[PDB]
Amino acid sequence: QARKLVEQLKMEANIDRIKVSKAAADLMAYCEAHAKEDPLLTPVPASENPF
Template sequence: MCSSNSVVQAQKLVDQLRVEASMERIKISLTAADLVQYCQDHRRSDPLLTGIAASSNPFKDKKTCVLL
């Protein structure tokens, strides 16, 4: 019983590896170039680069903390 279970698991693994091996891969250099281009095209609207205006920041503290 145990050996037939391991054979079934091994067959499933082989089938999965065949599917993964047959997938068409994208070159990393092309993907990186696309990512750089996207970042350059959208840098003006990126809040990490431009910051968030104090008037539109929903996480800004309403009151300041005063230490005595």
């Protein structure tokens, strides 16, 4: 039973990891790009709001 766990951790350890700064930049860029898409962030006018 322990063999499966150690094999799983061995597989998980050998992965390609990027810097946290790069991931943070990617999320920030995605949030900035799709800024004028979600009415929750930017309130859409009542004409285009179906609720």
